[PDB]
Design a protein around this ligand. Structure first.
Ligand SMILES: *[C@@H]1O[C@H](CO)[C@@H](O[C@@H]2O[C@H](CO)[C@@H](O[C@@H]3O[C@H](CO)[C@@H](O)[C@H](O)[C@@H]3O)[C@H](O)[C@H]2NC(C)=O)[C@H](O)[C@H]1NC(C)=O
Ligand SMILES: *[C@@H]1O[C@H](CO)[C@@H](O[C@@H]2O[C@H](CO)[C@@H](O[C@@H]3O[C@H](CO)[C@@H](O)[C@H](O)[C@@H]3O)[C@H](O)[C@H]2NC(C)=O)[C@H](O)[C@H]1NC(C)=O
Ligand SMILES: *[C@@H]1O[C@H](CO)[C@@H](O[C@@H]2O[C@H](CO)[C@@H](O[C@@H]3O[C@H](CO)[C@@H](O)[C@H](O)[C@@H]3O)[C@H](O)[C@H]2NC(C)=O)[C@H](O)[C@H]1NC(C)=O
Ligand SMILES: *[C@@H]1O[C@H](CO)[C@@H](O[C@@H]2O[C@H](CO)[C@@H](O[C@@H]3O[C@H](CO)[C@@H](O)[C@H](O)[C@@H]3O)[C@H](O)[C@H]2NC(C)=O)[C@H](O)[C@H]1NC(C)=O
Ligand SMILES: *[C@@H]1O[C@H](CO)[C@@H](O[C@@H]2O[C@H](CO)[C@@H](O)[C@H](O)[C@H]2NC(C)=O)[C@H](O)[C@H]1NC(C)=O
Ligand SMILES: *[C@@H]1O[C@H](CO)[C@@H](O[C@@H]2O[C@H](CO)[C@@H](O)[C@H](O)[C@H]2NC(C)=O)[C@H](O)[C@H]1NC(C)=O
Ligand SMILES: *[C@@H]1O[C@H](CO)[C@@H](O[C@@H]2O[C@H](CO)[C@@H](O)[C@H](O)[C@H]2NC(C)=O)[C@H](O)[C@H]1NC(C)=O
Ligand SMILES: *[C@@H]1O[C@H](CO)[C@@H](O[C@@H]2O[C@H](CO)[C@@H](O)[C@H](O)[C@H]2NC(C)=O)[C@H](O)[C@H]1NC(C)=O
Ligand SMILES: CCC(CC)O[C@@H]1C=C(C(=O)O)C[C@H](N)[C@H]1NC(C)=O
Ligand SMILES: CCC(CC)O[C@@H]1C=C(C(=O)O)C[C@H](N)[C@H]1NC(C)=O
Ligand SMILES: CCC(CC)O[C@@H]1C=C(C(=O)O)C[C@H](N)[C@H]1NC(C)=O
Ligand SMILES: CCC(CC)O[C@@H]1C=C(C(=O)O)C[C@H](N)[C@H]1NC(C)=O
Ligand SMILES: *[C@@H]1O[C@H](CO)[C@@H](O)[C@H](O)[C@H]1NC(C)=O
Ligand SMILES: *[C@@H]1O[C@H](CO)[C@@H](O)[C@H](O)[C@H]1NC(C)=O
Ligand SMILES: *[C@@H]1O[C@H](CO)[C@@H](O)[C@H](O)[C@H]1NC(C)=O
Ligand SMILES: *[C@@H]1O[C@H](CO)[C@@H](O)[C@H](O)[C@H]1NC(C)=O
Ligand SMILES: [Ca+2]
Ligand SMILES: [Ca+2]
Ligand SMILES: [Ca+2]
Ligand SMILES: [Ca+2]
Lengths: 390, 390, 390, 390
């Protein structure tokens, strides 16, 4: 029952919300687990939300200090898609402060990276059993995708980075079978820096849209042949810039070099679906802050430096906080002849942005899937009144 | 294993309570989810309560403002029948502020309507996967039944309305197979306005008892042939008026026109079971407010304008709040040769009626099923002391 | 897979605790459901605690007034044996203020009695579906066992009473098949009053030890032939009195008449296992109040008026509150050649006895099973500090 | 499907964290169950945490006094590995204040010891049904392993002790089949006192590393032949002392006699894996207090009195509290040709050590598994700020 990526992407004319956990609203009174960098992964039995918990709930004195990325009290949880995460409905999968997870059609592989900054180790599980460990190779925050990996013919591909966040680093493309590394390649191609890849599968290939945290406000792209287990890397061709922060959009993009100019923030995790005319990119509305979120239809954004926005859908209006965004697909919808693009938006609340109200940072989640036909409109922000928490 | 509606309704001589979640009483301390417009739907594995949550619990500061019908923080939950809804026992099914759900014998179809008032879209799921989307066709609060739909031979019928709440609107009768629209008809017949249909199946047909929010205090009725997938509409014939608000009962009803005179409130969701002599209608006891609830036996209420009440059972006494009511049936009770009529009553607490005590509105649920033999008596109100919440 | 009562009782030399939910201790902070009159019932998949909830938790303002026996907010819950009951782990089975439940080997039958005092109806379920209703026949608190019923060859026997609590009443022995009454007998024999029977099965028979709430401090006994579906009734023969309240033990008991003299309280639910020399009776230690609990070995207590106590085990010491007690047996322990006697003790806290500390009454549960070999000793009281709740 | 111990231990070059429940951090607000002496046990369907609860949660007034070891309100719970224990996710398995549990490949056997200090009885369950009881034989706190037992060919071995904690006592090696004792041996060999054995299986044998609470700061060891069901006992040979408290390490250890000198505390539960060069022992970092935890690689520690530490991994740094530690193995990882050593560390918080902050004592849990390859580093302490609880 190994997943074979034998399908193309569905045409997407618009997006609808399939899940929204409202975690922060509920978190005002219920024991909602403090989380960040969430994502969604499906498998033959359904879909679940995944997130990095902070070993505390919101209305808990330990919520103080949760802006920090890496502690010994972090781990990966999965909770039913659409539900806010509480202890009672959450599966504690592994311990660590960076993660990825995916199902190969028979078993789920999940990875957590734990330990000190200079001496970290990735813990790899298959079917919920420890299978292998991978030591830091650069000695500086070994880290991975923060969204679902993708599998094909029993092999799952994972993108990991080790080394400096703000200059040249050491990224590897890893191929796993049953939670064991069977092949590794150092990053090839023109992408100068790779972080937090959002990946999806199609026709025996995997496309990853990533984060250049070094120089680029245009997103790097990794292309993987899953049968040959080889890859190459590049940048998106559009001058429509979709990282944050970023300068104004250019008339002409650069397929092979990072476009610089970014005001301050070096990056945010994002995604895109590259399918010629059926090409959609995600983007914070603010070019400076993680506020708002919009889906842009940009035909051939992956190949044409003169590509332009043709359609736009607002997901979160610019008066509200967003954050990470990543791709996922139900690869086991056997009643559809195509893979339907889906994505999630992390809705970050608290610090640093709301430091005057609150000592914690957490997030809620909204998840969207594509429709081949025109849809209506609507904004889906976090919805909590932060003052309630002061 | 497709459900075939090959049975008639059981004779009902009286009603007994099968479930009562006591949500508001529990909500005084436990993290009960704030809800409204609930219902019940069965399937081969059992029955569950369905409701529209408000993205908060009662003892949560976000409970303030929950009188509002449509927000981005609303969604559909299912919880085990009889239990009050908390995060731990609730399945978050879709996002939206109007819904319906039913099982076809093999898979469950559920529908949520989400988005802005003028630009709404229905999201349709089959077996918990997004299958189709339906855009607003009138551009004014696309909306549906707020109780279970009904299926036959793999086809499920749904009633939806789009347009003005207080004048002529655009109602469609939709036929689904595996979450895909296979046929649509504009409303036919003499019913002038259709809202919030309560439907049940019998002998390859579906009967819907609805809400005329425009002119009528007598309830419109939709009759559907499930094999031909055609329908017609009408009003109940009785002069015993069962909407709220309503004027006094008339000696002679009108099978083909709305009976006007209503004091204030234009309508409330209700139901009826039309089976000749075995005909029962539901009704708030107050003709002005959503207080009390009574079951009335009115032989041939669906066909005879001179029909009269012959039996009455009080369900909720007039010193207590009620609200919506709708029909449901366990269509998979294979040990019975007949379909037993069941119904639920929404017990609304808080605003607007209890505005001086509280800033929220939510509801509890009581569910009843029929008995072919005389039963005893009893009132089953919400049971919370609203002052405890001040 | 119908249960056939083809086994005898195991020899019991002593008792050990298999479950203790500590509900009141936990109830100091956790949302423990307020309950009373609990019991235990097994089936092929395991054992669960059953209880009558009060539609509230302890640390909830609605806990005020829970001394009252019959409200519209009462129902039957089942929770995993050994766990304290919370909403998250409890199955809300039916609505009512008196109940019984048992598994026939294929399906579980459960019964709740609901409604007004003079107009009550029993609701009967089989495999969690409403099957039949039974109207009050005497018009005064139709009521039943408050512990598990027993089944044989597809037929389950239930004892119900309707009428006066303090004088002659109308008790029926009912035989059910798949939640349908197939036979009823009026009480026969010398027992003058029957309440709250504790029943167990053995060798195609059912023995019930009950409560004479009228005259007798000695317990009435009902003997049922399950193949013939006929019964007879009697009193325990011992002069060792095991109801509460009761006068001092007599040298000579009465097999056929109630022994009077009771100080105040007319009765409490209790049990016994009648197996010649292997005969054990339960008993509050105080002859006046529901405090303490002790198991007494009284050979031939069921047949010999000169029977004497030979062994004694203290379960709850006399400095602590007890309450109801009843019998249960795992009839699906296929690895044992005998049915092992088990019983539960209801540990009542709050009113009326602790009225000066608290406005609620609830209970915790301790459950014991027999051992064919000598065991050690120990007291297992509720364990809550009632002052914590003031 | 009986487990056959047909495998050897995997080589371990280092340890990674697979689970950390963060119970005390969560316990600041969520209803976390108060526990101590936890452990981990696997079976064909996965792994779960086991612990002795105290019949209360942390933020509960009944948490006051939980330093006491033995009450009637103690029992054994199992909760999903990695999750903190709450009522909603915990299985209440038996009642008592000492326990062990293991799966034989077909059914789980679990044991609780309950009752008074001089008159205790072990309750034994197989497949969650009471199977046998074992009365105290020395009349002084009958007690057992506080970690998982081990099974082979349908037989599970358990180590129990009865008698004085601070002098000669009466230890038995018990062999169970389906929860029935089939063989018992009095302790043989040179070990003078045996408490709280940590056991693991390998090649049809079981090795237990225990606690000499009488004289020895070096750990006693029990060797069991599982086919012959015979055992012998000894001490670890190393002069590297791994009990607490303990004097400084000696150059030469004693294979056959306890090494004395211990400052104060007579012992703590610990473990070791004895596999020649692949030999690892656990140890509190402080030789006086239960603070810190370190894994030491000591080749042939079980056979060579001149054995030395060669590798060391810090698990919990010496600024943090630890406690018990024990061994466990997933014996049903069929994709590995070897049994991978795993262990847990109990992280005790509260009294006696933090008596000035708090009136309770509880623990959190961290669980580690081996890796055949070098890993990174990191400390994994409890992580709660005890001042938050004052
Ligand atoms: C959340 O955690 C932060 C950090 O612990 C808390 O802020 C800190 O509060 C302490 C007082 O409890 C401040 O300590 C002070 O430090 C100065 C030196 O900077 C010293 O001279 C004083 O005697 C005092 O000890 C500390 O400065 C302050 N830190 C910051 C960054 O403001 C905060 O109060 C916590 N929030 C809640 C709601 O508890
Ligand atoms: C539940 O929500 C309502 C609405 O937010 C709260 O009522 C509102 O309370 C605010 C004060 O916090 C009032 O604001 C005032 O508005 C007037 C103008 O109308 C302005 O001149 C004042 O300076 C002040 O800002 C607001 O009027 C009031 N709204 C209503 C409709 O009464 C309510 O307090 C909330 N309940 C709880 C328990 O928090
Ligand atoms: C639990 O519920 C009981 C019953 O409602 C509460 O006791 C009652 O408290 C009210 C005051 O809130 C008393 O009302 C008084 O009644 C007298 C006539 O008897 C009237 O003249 C006074 O003006 C006043 O309204 C009532 O007597 C009293 N009932 C009893 C039996 O004492 C009790 O306070 C509740 N407990 C908690 C903790 O809220
Ligand atoms: C946790 O439990 C302990 C033990 O019950 C509490 O400490 C105790 O507090 C009581 C007062 O409530 C003290 O009682 C006093 O005893 C002396 C004789 O020793 C007597 O002369 C006084 O009249 C008074 O009754 C008791 O000494 C004290 N025990 C200890 C060991 O300090 C403690 O307060 C509880 N913690 C919390 C937060 O409630
Ligand atoms: C899917 O994976 C299998 C296993 O790796 C591939 O089949 C193997 O192909 C190699 C040669 O390329 C043979 O030596 C092995 O014996 C094959 N294994 C089996 C089990 O048949 C297969 O080629 C892969 N599919 C694709 C499309 O590449
Ligand atoms: C139940 O549904 C099936 C499928 O729609 C109906 O069977 C189809 O009937 C049409 C003609 O009306 C044929 O062309 C199809 O080939 C049939 N499909 C199958 C799978 O047999 C069937 O008629 C419906 N039942 C009723 C009573 O109307
Ligand atoms: C167990 O129950 C079955 C069903 O009631 C009994 O079998 C029936 O016996 C009657 C005569 O007594 C026959 O007329 C029926 O045809 C039988 N039914 C079946 C399905 O065989 C059976 O006798 C009962 N067992 C005992 C020991 O009394
Ligand atoms: C595993 O256990 C079984 C059962 O105890 C052992 O098989 C038994 O061996 C005895 C003689 O030693 C025979 O008398 C029994 O008839 C056997 N029972 C069965 C079911 O075959 C078996 O020897 C054990 N395995 C090992 C390796 O010792
Ligand atoms: C360490 C570099 C990495 C990518 C730039 O930083 C990320 C920045 C993130 C951010 O920009 O919000 C927060 C992430 N938690 C962090 N990842 C880790 C493992 O700490
Ligand atoms: C928008 C018209 C519609 C039917 C009249 O209003 C209903 C009135 C209801 C009512 O009268 O209580 C509340 C319902 N939540 C609402 N439905 C929606 C989708 O908002
Ligand atoms: C109504 C008579 C009946 C038996 C004497 O009273 C019982 C007394 C019980 C008791 O003595 O504690 C409380 C029970 N809840 C009650 N049963 C019902 C249905 O109310
Ligand atoms: C009774 C002797 C026994 C072993 C020394 O004491 C243990 C000491 C333990 C300890 O040193 O922390 C606490 C354990 N809870 C206790 N075991 C029991 C059953 O009480
Ligand atoms: C409805 O939403 C779509 C975006 O999906 C937008 O193009 C369209 O203009 C909207 N219609 C109205 C009336 O706002
Ligand atoms: C019992 O209830 C029925 C209604 O179901 C009613 O007709 C009857 O009069 C009631 N009996 C009494 C005595 O109240
Ligand atoms: C142990 O308990 C039994 C009761 O089960 C009792 O007979 C015996 O005397 C007790 N032993 C001691 C030493 O208390
Ligand atoms: C990483 O951890 C190992 C222990 O597992 C240790 O031997 C090594 O020195 C560490 N490396 C660094 C750079 O700290
Ligand atoms: Ca960037
Ligand atoms: Ca109307
Ligand atoms: Ca009596
Ligand atoms: Ca020692």
């Amino acid at each position: 029952n190994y997943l074979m990526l034998n399908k193309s992407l569905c045409k997407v004319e618009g997006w609808v919300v399939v899940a929204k956990d409202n975690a922060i609203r509920f978190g005002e009174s219920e024991q909602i687990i403090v989380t960040r960098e969430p994502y969604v992964s499906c498998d033959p039995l359904g879909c679940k939300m995944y997130a990095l918990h902070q070993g505390t709930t919101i209305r808990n004195k330990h919520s103080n200090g949760t802006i920090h990325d890496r502690t010994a009290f972090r781990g990966l949880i999965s909770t039913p898609l659409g539900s806010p995460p509480i202890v009672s409905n959450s599966d504690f999968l592994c311990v660590g402060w960076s993660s990825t997870s995916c199902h190969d059609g028979i078993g789920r592989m999940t990875i957590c990276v734990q330990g000190n900054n200079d001496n970290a180790t990735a813990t790899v599980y298959y079917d919920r059993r420890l299978t292998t460990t991978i030591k830091t190779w650069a000695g500086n925050i070994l880290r991975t995708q923060e969204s679902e990996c993708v599998c094909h013919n029993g092999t799952c591909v994972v993108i990991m980075t080790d080394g400096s966040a703000s200059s040249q680093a050491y990224t590897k493309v890893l191929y796993f079978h049953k939670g064991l590394v069977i092949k590794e390649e150092a990053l090839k191609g023109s992408a100068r820096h790779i972080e937090e890849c959002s990946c999806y599968g199609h026709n025996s290939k995997v496309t990853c849209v990533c984060r250049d945290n070094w120089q680029g406000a245009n997103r790097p792209v990794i292309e993987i042949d899953m049968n040959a287990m080889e890859h190459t890397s590049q940048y998106l061709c559009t001058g429509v810039l979709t990282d944050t922060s970023r300068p104004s959009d250019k008339s002409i993009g650069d397929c092979n070099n990072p476009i610089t100019g970014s005001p301050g923030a070096p990056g945010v995790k994002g995604f895109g679906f590259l399918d010629s005319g059926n090409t959609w990119l995600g983007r914070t509305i603010s070019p400076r802050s993680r506020s708002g979120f919009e889906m842009l239809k940009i035909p051939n954004a992956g190949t044409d430096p003169n590509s332009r926005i043709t359609e736009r859908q607002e997901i979160v209006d610019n008066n509200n906080w967003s954050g990470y965004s990543g791709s996922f697909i139900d690869y086991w919808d056997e009643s559809s002849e195509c893979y339907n693009p889906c994505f999630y938006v992390e809705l970050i609340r608290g610090r640093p942005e709301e430091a005057k109200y609150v000592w914690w940072t957490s997030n809620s989640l909204v998840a969207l899937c594509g429709s081949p036909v025109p849809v209506g409109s609507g904004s889906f922000p976090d919805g909590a009144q932060i003052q309630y928490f002061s």
